[PDB]
Amino acid sequence: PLESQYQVGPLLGFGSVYSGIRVSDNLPVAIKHVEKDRISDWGELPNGTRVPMEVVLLKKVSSGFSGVIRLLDWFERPDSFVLILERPEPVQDLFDFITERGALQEELARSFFWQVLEAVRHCHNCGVLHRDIKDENILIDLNRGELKLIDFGSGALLKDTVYTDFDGTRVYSPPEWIRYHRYHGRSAAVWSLGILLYDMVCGDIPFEHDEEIIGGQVFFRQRVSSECQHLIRWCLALRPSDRPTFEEIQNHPWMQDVLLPQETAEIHLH
Amino acid sequence: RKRRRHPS
Ligand SMILES: Nc1ccc(-c2n[nH]nc2-c2ccc(C(=O)O)cc2)cc1
């Protein structure tokens, strides 16, 4: 039973996520409700039970690596599924963090971006494509300086063939999706990481309209180092084959000498 | 300049 195993609190944050505590060990959790009528892609568990694809993807990435949110449990109800998700405390998502702080110092953006890269690599290694990388979908564990990727509700199994469907965030989507309604998983992910990196070092995303997305011009509204500008422009290459691999991103000169998560918390979050 | 969230 769900009502007997968790103490349910107030809403957090058209989504339905509640604060919670696991009665067993007083662990803080987030309790996410998903209506069956609104589920786009369905999947099957090893037991063959029909579950939301979100549950499938969350189970595939769940492990000791704390760069991705951990699905602690889930329940099925007549008209909905309920997901028990990890809740760090204290926490703030990266969108609110950038709103309150403005453009991030490059040392801090480097640490955050590096941790997002490791988390996305973990997803891909587990066969999972997130498809909605953005600052809203990144939680900051403020005391540990660790970032957590959340909300796989738009994700898919990773494949090497073309995708013709998309339900992530349009202003983070690549120009090949805007123009042709097709994309490949990894190069589309890299485009969204370019949007995210610009967002971190300039204080907001670069493109709001389709014509900006396909236009291929990146104006920098903030002082940004030449090295970081190069990485961003590389990630935002119009031709997908021109974009860097994850290895090329992490080997880029701007990415060297990253701070550890604990150093990040003490220098920038405490 | 207005900064905003963008639903999926
Ligand atoms: N603005 C905002 C504030 C607090 C949370 C939060 N806090 N603790 N867990 C969560 C959480 C984790 C995963 C998911 C998901 O995977 O959908 C949703 C929420 C999320 C956002």
PDB file of C-alpha atoms and ligand atoms in Angstrom:
ATOM      1  CA  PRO A   1       0.000   0.000   0.000  1.00  0.00           C
ATOM      2  CA  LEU A   2       1.154   3.538  -0.814  1.00  0.00           C
ATOM      3  CA  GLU A   3      -0.768   5.508   1.825  1.00  0.00           C
ATOM      4  CA  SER A   4       0.578   3.201   4.561  1.00  0.00           C
ATOM      5  CA  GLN A   5       4.265   3.215   3.559  1.00  0.00           C
ATOM      6  CA  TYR A   6       4.762   6.955   2.927  1.00  0.00           C
ATOM      7  CA  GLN A   7       3.757  10.138   4.718  1.00  0.00           C
ATOM      8  CA  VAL A   8       2.482  12.493   2.005  1.00  0.00           C
ATOM      9  CA  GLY A   9       3.088  16.228   2.218  1.00  0.00           C
ATOM     10  CA  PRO A  10       2.309  19.254   0.060  1.00  0.00           C
ATOM     11  CA  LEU A  11       2.874  19.824  -3.639  1.00  0.00           C
ATOM     12  CA  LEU A  12       6.406  20.576  -4.833  1.00  0.00           C
ATOM     13  CA  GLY A  13       7.431  23.108  -7.464  1.00  0.00           C
ATOM     14  CA  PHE A  14       0.169  20.908 -14.686  1.00  0.00           C
ATOM     15  CA  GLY A  15       2.441  18.364 -12.996  1.00  0.00           C
ATOM     16  CA  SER A  16       1.701  16.533  -9.741  1.00  0.00           C
ATOM     17  CA  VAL A  17       4.749  15.924  -7.530  1.00  0.00           C
ATOM     18  CA  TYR A  18       4.308  15.847  -3.745  1.00  0.00           C
ATOM     19  CA  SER A  19       6.815  16.072  -0.934  1.00  0.00           C
ATOM     20  CA  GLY A  20       7.038  12.846   1.030  1.00  0.00           C
ATOM     21  CA  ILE A  21       8.827  10.889   3.729  1.00  0.00           C
ATOM     22  CA  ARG A  22       9.292   7.116   3.716  1.00  0.00           C
ATOM     23  CA  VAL A  23       7.831   5.917   7.021  1.00  0.00           C
ATOM     24  CA  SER A  24      10.421   3.122   7.246  1.00  0.00           C
ATOM     25  CA  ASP A  25      13.537   5.296   7.611  1.00  0.00           C
ATOM     26  CA  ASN A  26      12.154   8.881   7.448  1.00  0.00           C
ATOM     27  CA  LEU A  27      13.874   9.234   4.069  1.00  0.00           C
ATOM     28  CA  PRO A  28      12.815  12.311   2.059  1.00  0.00           C
ATOM     29  CA  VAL A  29      11.124  11.347  -1.211  1.00  0.00           C
ATOM     30  CA  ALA A  30       9.196  12.956  -4.053  1.00  0.00           C
ATOM     31  CA  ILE A  31       5.888  11.324  -4.980  1.00  0.00           C
ATOM     32  CA  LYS A  32       5.053  11.782  -8.664  1.00  0.00           C
ATOM     33  CA  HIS A  33       1.612  10.952 -10.072  1.00  0.00           C
ATOM     34  CA  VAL A  34       1.105  10.207 -13.778  1.00  0.00           C
ATOM     35  CA  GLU A  35      -2.330   9.745 -15.345  1.00  0.00           C
ATOM     36  CA  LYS A  36      -2.705   6.707 -17.592  1.00  0.00           C
ATOM     37  CA  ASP A  37      -4.864   8.718 -20.010  1.00  0.00           C
ATOM     38  CA  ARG A  38      -1.945  11.111 -20.646  1.00  0.00           C
ATOM     39  CA  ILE A  39       0.853   8.557 -21.153  1.00  0.00           C
ATOM     40  CA  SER A  40       2.482   8.794 -24.583  1.00  0.00           C
ATOM     41  CA  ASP A  41       4.806   5.767 -24.820  1.00  0.00           C
ATOM     42  CA  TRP A  42       4.238   2.508 -22.945  1.00  0.00           C
ATOM     43  CA  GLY A  43       6.777  -0.186 -22.148  1.00  0.00           C
ATOM     44  CA  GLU A  44       6.970  -3.632 -20.599  1.00  0.00           C
ATOM     45  CA  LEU A  45       8.856  -4.773 -17.513  1.00  0.00           C
ATOM     46  CA  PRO A  46      10.739  -8.090 -17.307  1.00  0.00           C
ATOM     47  CA  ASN A  47       7.560  -9.467 -15.711  1.00  0.00           C
ATOM     48  CA  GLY A  48       5.707  -8.305 -18.840  1.00  0.00           C
ATOM     49  CA  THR A  49       3.585  -5.799 -16.912  1.00  0.00           C
ATOM     50  CA  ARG A  50       2.621  -2.794 -19.042  1.00  0.00           C
ATOM     51  CA  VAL A  51       4.212   0.249 -17.379  1.00  0.00           C
ATOM     52  CA  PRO A  52       4.934   3.792 -18.562  1.00  0.00           C
ATOM     53  CA  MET A  53       8.137   3.989 -20.581  1.00  0.00           C
ATOM     54  CA  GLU A  54       9.268   6.516 -17.955  1.00  0.00           C
ATOM     55  CA  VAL A  55       9.350   3.688 -15.408  1.00  0.00           C
ATOM     56  CA  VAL A  56      11.269   1.477 -17.851  1.00  0.00           C
ATOM     57  CA  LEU A  57      13.910   4.151 -18.422  1.00  0.00           C
ATOM     58  CA  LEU A  58      14.195   5.039 -14.731  1.00  0.00           C
ATOM     59  CA  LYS A  59      14.828   1.393 -13.829  1.00  0.00           C
ATOM     60  CA  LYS A  60      17.524   1.063 -16.506  1.00  0.00           C
ATOM     61  CA  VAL A  61      19.501   4.049 -15.150  1.00  0.00           C
ATOM     62  CA  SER A  62      18.984   3.325 -11.438  1.00  0.00           C
ATOM     63  CA  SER A  63      22.176   2.345  -9.594  1.00  0.00           C
ATOM     64  CA  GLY A  64      24.906   3.746  -7.346  1.00  0.00           C
ATOM     65  CA  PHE A  65      25.717   6.622  -9.703  1.00  0.00           C
ATOM     66  CA  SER A  66      24.051   9.677  -8.168  1.00  0.00           C
ATOM     67  CA  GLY A  67      24.070  11.850 -11.296  1.00  0.00           C
ATOM     68  CA  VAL A  68      20.614  10.595 -12.260  1.00  0.00           C
ATOM     69  CA  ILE A  69      17.548  10.625 -10.024  1.00  0.00           C
ATOM     70  CA  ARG A  70      16.836   7.245  -8.424  1.00  0.00           C
ATOM     71  CA  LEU A  71      13.401   5.653  -8.761  1.00  0.00           C
ATOM     72  CA  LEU A  72      12.918   4.153  -5.303  1.00  0.00           C
ATOM     73  CA  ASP A  73       9.602   2.375  -5.984  1.00  0.00           C
ATOM     74  CA  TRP A  74       6.406   2.660  -7.990  1.00  0.00           C
ATOM     75  CA  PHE A  75       2.743   1.696  -7.701  1.00  0.00           C
ATOM     76  CA  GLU A  76      -0.091   1.159 -10.160  1.00  0.00           C
ATOM     77  CA  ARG A  77      -3.557   2.593  -9.458  1.00  0.00           C
ATOM     78  CA  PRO A  78      -6.795   2.267 -11.496  1.00  0.00           C
ATOM     79  CA  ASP A  79      -6.240   5.519 -13.426  1.00  0.00           C
ATOM     80  CA  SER A  80      -2.602   6.380 -12.714  1.00  0.00           C
ATOM     81  CA  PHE A  81       0.910   5.323 -11.810  1.00  0.00           C
ATOM     82  CA  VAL A  82       2.715   6.670  -8.749  1.00  0.00           C
ATOM     83  CA  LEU A  83       6.500   7.042  -8.763  1.00  0.00           C
ATOM     84  CA  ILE A  84       8.578   7.278  -5.583  1.00  0.00           C
ATOM     85  CA  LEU A  85      11.599   9.392  -6.471  1.00  0.00           C
ATOM     86  CA  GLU A  86      14.666  10.559  -4.595  1.00  0.00           C
ATOM     87  CA  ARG A  87      14.465  13.991  -2.954  1.00  0.00           C
ATOM     88  CA  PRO A  88      17.704  15.682  -1.879  1.00  0.00           C
ATOM     89  CA  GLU A  89      17.455  18.244   0.899  1.00  0.00           C
ATOM     90  CA  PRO A  90      18.282  21.096   0.631  1.00  0.00           C
ATOM     91  CA  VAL A  91      17.684  21.287  -3.136  1.00  0.00           C
ATOM     92  CA  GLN A  92      17.029  23.802  -5.909  1.00  0.00           C
ATOM     93  CA  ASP A  93      16.610  23.137  -9.588  1.00  0.00           C
ATOM     94  CA  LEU A  94      19.092  24.670 -12.007  1.00  0.00           C
ATOM     95  CA  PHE A  95      16.468  26.934 -13.606  1.00  0.00           C
ATOM     96  CA  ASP A  96      15.666  28.737 -10.331  1.00  0.00           C
ATOM     97  CA  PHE A  97      19.373  28.749  -9.459  1.00  0.00           C
ATOM     98  CA  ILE A  98      20.276  30.566 -12.680  1.00  0.00           C
ATOM     99  CA  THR A  99      17.321  32.942 -12.272  1.00  0.00           C
ATOM    100  CA  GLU A 100      18.444  33.986  -8.792  1.00  0.00           C
ATOM    101  CA  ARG A 101      22.179  34.140  -9.571  1.00  0.00           C
ATOM    102  CA  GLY A 102      22.201  35.356 -13.154  1.00  0.00           C
ATOM    103  CA  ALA A 103      25.006  34.204 -15.424  1.00  0.00           C
ATOM    104  CA  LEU A 104      27.232  31.665 -13.691  1.00  0.00           C
ATOM    105  CA  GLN A 105      30.969  32.102 -13.251  1.00  0.00           C
ATOM    106  CA  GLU A 106      32.683  29.801 -15.746  1.00  0.00           C
ATOM    107  CA  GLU A 107      34.325  27.776 -12.958  1.00  0.00           C
ATOM    108  CA  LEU A 108      30.861  26.941 -11.619  1.00  0.00           C
ATOM    109  CA  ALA A 109      29.372  26.364 -15.074  1.00  0.00           C
ATOM    110  CA  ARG A 110      32.294  24.037 -15.808  1.00  0.00           C
ATOM    111  CA  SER A 111      31.628  21.900 -12.729  1.00  0.00           C
ATOM    112  CA  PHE A 112      27.875  21.762 -13.410  1.00  0.00           C
ATOM    113  CA  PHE A 113      28.242  21.070 -17.143  1.00  0.00           C
ATOM    114  CA  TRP A 114      30.816  18.342 -16.470  1.00  0.00           C
ATOM    115  CA  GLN A 115      28.443  16.633 -14.034  1.00  0.00           C
ATOM    116  CA  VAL A 116      25.605  16.849 -16.574  1.00  0.00           C
ATOM    117  CA  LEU A 117      27.903  15.247 -19.157  1.00  0.00           C
ATOM    118  CA  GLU A 118      28.728  12.349 -16.820  1.00  0.00           C
ATOM    119  CA  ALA A 119      25.026  11.863 -16.056  1.00  0.00           C
ATOM    120  CA  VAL A 120      24.024  11.829 -19.730  1.00  0.00           C
ATOM    121  CA  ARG A 121      26.864   9.419 -20.526  1.00  0.00           C
ATOM    122  CA  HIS A 122      25.476   7.176 -17.785  1.00  0.00           C
ATOM    123  CA  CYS A 123      22.022   7.316 -19.392  1.00  0.00           C
ATOM    124  CA  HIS A 124      23.379   6.418 -22.829  1.00  0.00           C
ATOM    125  CA  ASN A 125      25.516   3.597 -21.404  1.00  0.00           C
ATOM    126  CA  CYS A 126      22.335   2.175 -19.835  1.00  0.00           C
ATOM    127  CA  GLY A 127      20.479   2.349 -23.168  1.00  0.00           C
ATOM    128  CA  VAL A 128      18.442   5.463 -22.278  1.00  0.00           C
ATOM    129  CA  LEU A 129      17.994   8.721 -24.215  1.00  0.00           C
ATOM    130  CA  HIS A 130      16.641  11.504 -21.999  1.00  0.00           C
ATOM    131  CA  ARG A 131      15.428  13.837 -24.818  1.00  0.00           C
ATOM    132  CA  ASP A 132      14.610  16.735 -22.462  1.00  0.00           C
ATOM    133  CA  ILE A 133      17.931  17.995 -21.099  1.00  0.00           C
ATOM    134  CA  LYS A 134      17.388  21.514 -19.740  1.00  0.00           C
ATOM    135  CA  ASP A 135      18.006  23.505 -16.575  1.00  0.00           C
ATOM    136  CA  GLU A 136      14.460  22.797 -15.345  1.00  0.00           C
ATOM    137  CA  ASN A 137      15.282  19.066 -15.371  1.00  0.00           C
ATOM    138  CA  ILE A 138      18.452  19.317 -13.258  1.00  0.00           C
ATOM    139  CA  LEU A 139      18.378  19.308  -9.449  1.00  0.00           C
ATOM    140  CA  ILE A 140      21.229  20.742  -7.374  1.00  0.00           C
ATOM    141  CA  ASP A 141      22.047  18.973  -4.108  1.00  0.00           C
ATOM    142  CA  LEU A 142      23.248  22.199  -2.510  1.00  0.00           C
ATOM    143  CA  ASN A 143      25.097  20.577   0.398  1.00  0.00           C
ATOM    144  CA  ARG A 144      26.954  18.002  -1.711  1.00  0.00           C
ATOM    145  CA  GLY A 145      27.363  20.123  -4.857  1.00  0.00           C
ATOM    146  CA  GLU A 146      26.004  17.226  -6.936  1.00  0.00           C
ATOM    147  CA  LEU A 147      23.588  17.642  -9.842  1.00  0.00           C
ATOM    148  CA  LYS A 148      20.805  15.158 -10.618  1.00  0.00           C
ATOM    149  CA  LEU A 149      19.056  14.691 -13.963  1.00  0.00           C
ATOM    150  CA  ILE A 150      15.284  14.303 -13.513  1.00  0.00           C
ATOM    151  CA  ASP A 151      12.069  13.760 -15.504  1.00  0.00           C
ATOM    152  CA  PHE A 152      12.441  10.980 -18.070  1.00  0.00           C
ATOM    153  CA  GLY A 153       8.812  11.460 -19.170  1.00  0.00           C
ATOM    154  CA  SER A 154       9.989  12.402 -22.680  1.00  0.00           C
ATOM    155  CA  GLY A 155      12.787   9.833 -22.933  1.00  0.00           C
ATOM    156  CA  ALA A 156      13.208   6.773 -25.117  1.00  0.00           C
ATOM    157  CA  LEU A 157      15.334   3.692 -25.466  1.00  0.00           C
ATOM    158  CA  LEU A 158      18.573   4.752 -27.121  1.00  0.00           C
ATOM    159  CA  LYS A 159      18.918   3.656 -30.750  1.00  0.00           C
ATOM    160  CA  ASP A 160      21.230   4.453 -33.654  1.00  0.00           C
ATOM    161  CA  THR A 161      18.460   4.939 -36.238  1.00  0.00           C
ATOM    162  CA  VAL A 162      16.506   8.126 -36.858  1.00  0.00           C
ATOM    163  CA  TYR A 163      13.836   9.378 -34.464  1.00  0.00           C
ATOM    164  CA  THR A 164      10.694  10.842 -36.031  1.00  0.00           C
ATOM    165  CA  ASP A 165       8.876  11.682 -32.764  1.00  0.00           C
ATOM    166  CA  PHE A 166       9.694  14.234 -30.071  1.00  0.00           C
ATOM    167  CA  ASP A 167       7.943  15.524 -26.944  1.00  0.00           C
ATOM    168  CA  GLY A 168      10.759  17.380 -25.162  1.00  0.00           C
ATOM    169  CA  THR A 169      11.293  21.135 -24.970  1.00  0.00           C
ATOM    170  CA  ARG A 170      11.180  22.868 -28.349  1.00  0.00           C
ATOM    171  CA  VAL A 171      13.642  25.672 -27.535  1.00  0.00           C
ATOM    172  CA  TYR A 172      16.235  23.015 -26.637  1.00  0.00           C
ATOM    173  CA  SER A 173      15.488  20.902 -29.743  1.00  0.00           C
ATOM    174  CA  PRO A 174      17.874  20.819 -32.704  1.00  0.00           C
ATOM    175  CA  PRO A 175      17.324  22.497 -36.085  1.00  0.00           C
ATOM    176  CA  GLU A 176      16.982  19.155 -37.883  1.00  0.00           C
ATOM    177  CA  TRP A 177      13.896  18.540 -35.735  1.00  0.00           C
ATOM    178  CA  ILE A 178      12.566  22.040 -36.462  1.00  0.00           C
ATOM    179  CA  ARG A 179      13.117  21.669 -40.213  1.00  0.00           C
ATOM    180  CA  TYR A 180      12.635  17.975 -41.015  1.00  0.00           C
ATOM    181  CA  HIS A 181      11.003  16.380 -37.926  1.00  0.00           C
ATOM    182  CA  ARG A 182      13.902  13.926 -37.700  1.00  0.00           C
ATOM    183  CA  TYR A 183      17.010  13.635 -35.538  1.00  0.00           C
ATOM    184  CA  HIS A 184      19.546  11.163 -34.218  1.00  0.00           C
ATOM    185  CA  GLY A 185      19.754  10.657 -30.485  1.00  0.00           C
ATOM    186  CA  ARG A 186      23.305  11.591 -29.535  1.00  0.00           C
ATOM    187  CA  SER A 187      23.757  14.614 -31.793  1.00  0.00           C
ATOM    188  CA  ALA A 188      20.367  15.959 -30.677  1.00  0.00           C
ATOM    189  CA  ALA A 189      21.470  15.514 -27.060  1.00  0.00           C
ATOM    190  CA  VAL A 190      24.666  17.453 -27.804  1.00  0.00           C
ATOM    191  CA  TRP A 191      22.656  20.339 -29.273  1.00  0.00           C
ATOM    192  CA  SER A 192      20.566  20.547 -26.091  1.00  0.00           C
ATOM    193  CA  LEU A 193      23.796  20.544 -24.074  1.00  0.00           C
ATOM    194  CA  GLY A 194      24.975  23.513 -26.134  1.00  0.00           C
ATOM    195  CA  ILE A 195      21.748  25.343 -25.274  1.00  0.00           C
ATOM    196  CA  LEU A 196      22.256  24.407 -21.617  1.00  0.00           C
ATOM    197  CA  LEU A 197      25.872  25.603 -21.514  1.00  0.00           C
ATOM    198  CA  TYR A 198      24.986  28.966 -23.086  1.00  0.00           C
ATOM    199  CA  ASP A 199      22.130  29.183 -20.571  1.00  0.00           C
ATOM    200  CA  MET A 200      24.595  28.709 -17.706  1.00  0.00           C
ATOM    201  CA  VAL A 201      27.233  31.254 -18.767  1.00  0.00           C
ATOM    202  CA  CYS A 202      24.855  33.900 -20.176  1.00  0.00           C
ATOM    203  CA  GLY A 203      21.961  33.581 -17.710  1.00  0.00           C
ATOM    204  CA  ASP A 204      19.307  32.520 -20.235  1.00  0.00           C
ATOM    205  CA  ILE A 205      18.940  30.312 -23.307  1.00  0.00           C
ATOM    206  CA  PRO A 206      20.035  31.766 -26.680  1.00  0.00           C
ATOM    207  CA  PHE A 207      17.008  30.942 -28.853  1.00  0.00           C
ATOM    208  CA  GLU A 208      13.296  31.522 -28.271  1.00  0.00           C
ATOM    209  CA  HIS A 209      11.957  31.141 -31.837  1.00  0.00           C
ATOM    210  CA  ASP A 210      12.258  28.533 -34.586  1.00  0.00           C
ATOM    211  CA  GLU A 211      14.012  30.979 -36.910  1.00  0.00           C
ATOM    212  CA  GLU A 212      16.735  31.587 -34.318  1.00  0.00           C
ATOM    213  CA  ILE A 213      17.178  27.829 -33.837  1.00  0.00           C
ATOM    214  CA  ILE A 214      17.730  27.174 -37.551  1.00  0.00           C
ATOM    215  CA  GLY A 215      19.568  30.441 -38.231  1.00  0.00           C
ATOM    216  CA  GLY A 216      22.987  29.301 -37.053  1.00  0.00           C
ATOM    217  CA  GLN A 217      24.053  32.502 -35.261  1.00  0.00           C
ATOM    218  CA  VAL A 218      25.053  32.587 -31.584  1.00  0.00           C
ATOM    219  CA  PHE A 219      25.254  36.097 -30.114  1.00  0.00           C
ATOM    220  CA  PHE A 220      26.848  36.235 -26.657  1.00  0.00           C
ATOM    221  CA  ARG A 221      24.999  38.654 -24.361  1.00  0.00           C
ATOM    222  CA  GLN A 222      27.582  38.218 -21.588  1.00  0.00           C
ATOM    223  CA  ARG A 223      31.339  38.205 -21.311  1.00  0.00           C
ATOM    224  CA  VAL A 224      32.248  34.586 -22.119  1.00  0.00           C
ATOM    225  CA  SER A 225      35.771  33.248 -22.663  1.00  0.00           C
ATOM    226  CA  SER A 226      36.861  32.382 -26.208  1.00  0.00           C
ATOM    227  CA  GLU A 227      37.328  28.743 -25.162  1.00  0.00           C
ATOM    228  CA  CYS A 228      33.775  28.448 -23.814  1.00  0.00           C
ATOM    229  CA  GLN A 229      32.305  30.270 -26.834  1.00  0.00           C
ATOM    230  CA  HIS A 230      34.056  27.773 -29.116  1.00  0.00           C
ATOM    231  CA  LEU A 231      32.646  24.771 -27.231  1.00  0.00           C
ATOM    232  CA  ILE A 232      29.129  26.241 -27.300  1.00  0.00           C
ATOM    233  CA  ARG A 233      29.278  27.066 -31.010  1.00  0.00           C
ATOM    234  CA  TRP A 234      30.644  23.572 -31.675  1.00  0.00           C
ATOM    235  CA  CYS A 235      27.759  21.946 -29.771  1.00  0.00           C
ATOM    236  CA  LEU A 236      25.361  24.167 -31.762  1.00  0.00           C
ATOM    237  CA  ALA A 237      26.672  23.246 -35.221  1.00  0.00           C
ATOM    238  CA  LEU A 238      23.721  23.238 -37.623  1.00  0.00           C
ATOM    239  CA  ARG A 239      24.875  20.021 -39.296  1.00  0.00           C
ATOM    240  CA  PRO A 240      24.530  17.184 -36.733  1.00  0.00           C
ATOM    241  CA  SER A 241      27.650  15.384 -38.003  1.00  0.00           C
ATOM    242  CA  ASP A 242      29.623  18.581 -37.255  1.00  0.00           C
ATOM    243  CA  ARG A 243      28.814  18.423 -33.537  1.00  0.00           C
ATOM    244  CA  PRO A 244      31.290  16.987 -31.023  1.00  0.00           C
ATOM    245  CA  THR A 245      30.990  13.593 -29.422  1.00  0.00           C
ATOM    246  CA  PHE A 246      30.770  13.461 -25.643  1.00  0.00           C
ATOM    247  CA  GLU A 247      34.460  12.499 -25.610  1.00  0.00           C
ATOM    248  CA  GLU A 248      35.303  15.584 -27.672  1.00  0.00           C
ATOM    249  CA  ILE A 249      33.275  17.772 -25.294  1.00  0.00           C
ATOM    250  CA  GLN A 250      35.039  16.438 -22.200  1.00  0.00           C
ATOM    251  CA  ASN A 251      38.462  16.689 -23.885  1.00  0.00           C
ATOM    252  CA  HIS A 252      37.809  20.294 -24.952  1.00  0.00           C
ATOM    253  CA  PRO A 253      40.276  22.830 -23.446  1.00  0.00           C
ATOM    254  CA  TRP A 254      37.494  24.705 -21.631  1.00  0.00           C
ATOM    255  CA  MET A 255      36.538  21.526 -19.732  1.00  0.00           C
ATOM    256  CA  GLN A 256      39.927  20.836 -18.133  1.00  0.00           C
ATOM    257  CA  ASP A 257      40.685  21.072 -14.395  1.00  0.00           C
ATOM    258  CA  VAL A 258      37.063  20.701 -13.289  1.00  0.00           C
ATOM    259  CA  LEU A 259      36.215  21.142  -9.615  1.00  0.00           C
ATOM    260  CA  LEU A 260      35.127  18.170  -7.548  1.00  0.00           C
ATOM    261  CA  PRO A 261      31.489  18.262  -6.367  1.00  0.00           C
ATOM    262  CA  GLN A 262      32.469  18.958  -2.745  1.00  0.00           C
ATOM    263  CA  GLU A 263      34.812  21.777  -3.795  1.00  0.00           C
ATOM    264  CA  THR A 264      31.935  23.136  -5.890  1.00  0.00           C
ATOM    265  CA  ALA A 265      29.633  23.190  -2.857  1.00  0.00           C
ATOM    266  CA  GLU A 266      32.170  24.880  -0.574  1.00  0.00           C
ATOM    267  CA  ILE A 267      33.370  27.521  -3.047  1.00  0.00           C
ATOM    268  CA  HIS A 268      30.075  28.292  -4.776  1.00  0.00           C
ATOM    269  CA  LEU A 269      27.107  26.946  -2.773  1.00  0.00           C
ATOM    270  CA  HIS A 270      27.963  27.399   0.930  1.00  0.00           C
TER     271      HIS A 270
ATOM    272  CA  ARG B   1      14.857  40.663 -20.636  1.00  0.00           C
ATOM    273  CA  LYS B   2      12.172  38.144 -19.667  1.00  0.00           C
ATOM    274  CA  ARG B   3      13.403  34.677 -18.691  1.00  0.00           C
ATOM    275  CA  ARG B   4      10.780  31.941 -18.595  1.00  0.00           C
ATOM    276  CA  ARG B   5      10.245  28.219 -18.263  1.00  0.00           C
ATOM    277  CA  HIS B   6       9.189  26.205 -21.323  1.00  0.00           C
ATOM    278  CA  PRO B   7       6.850  23.237 -20.760  1.00  0.00           C
ATOM    279  CA  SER B   8       7.473  19.999 -22.628  1.00  0.00           C
TER     280      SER B   8
HETATM  281  N1  LIG C   1      11.203  22.447  -9.125  1.00  0.00           N
HETATM  282  C1  LIG C   1      11.407  21.219  -8.508  1.00  0.00           C
HETATM  283  C2  LIG C   1      11.523  21.128  -7.118  1.00  0.00           C
HETATM  284  C3  LIG C   1      11.748  19.907  -6.506  1.00  0.00           C
HETATM  285  C4  LIG C   1      11.867  18.739  -7.259  1.00  0.00           C
HETATM  286  C5  LIG C   1      12.204  17.473  -6.574  1.00  0.00           C
HETATM  287  N2  LIG C   1      12.658  17.484  -5.317  1.00  0.00           N
HETATM  288  N3  LIG C   1      12.911  16.206  -5.055  1.00  0.00           N
HETATM  289  N4  LIG C   1      12.675  15.313  -6.010  1.00  0.00           N
HETATM  290  C6  LIG C   1      12.217  16.047  -7.029  1.00  0.00           C
HETATM  291  C7  LIG C   1      11.886  15.412  -8.320  1.00  0.00           C
HETATM  292  C8  LIG C   1      12.679  14.370  -8.792  1.00  0.00           C
HETATM  293  C9  LIG C   1      12.380  13.734  -9.982  1.00  0.00           C
HETATM  294  C10 LIG C   1      11.277  14.124 -10.739  1.00  0.00           C
HETATM  295  C11 LIG C   1      10.980  13.456 -12.057  1.00  0.00           C
HETATM  296  O1  LIG C   1      11.750  12.527 -12.424  1.00  0.00           O
HETATM  297  O2  LIG C   1       9.993  13.866 -12.712  1.00  0.00           O
HETATM  298  C12 LIG C   1      10.484  15.165 -10.267  1.00  0.00           C
HETATM  299  C13 LIG C   1      10.782  15.801  -9.076  1.00  0.00           C
HETATM  300  C14 LIG C   1      11.750  18.825  -8.646  1.00  0.00           C
HETATM  301  C15 LIG C   1      11.524  20.044  -9.263  1.00  0.00           C
END
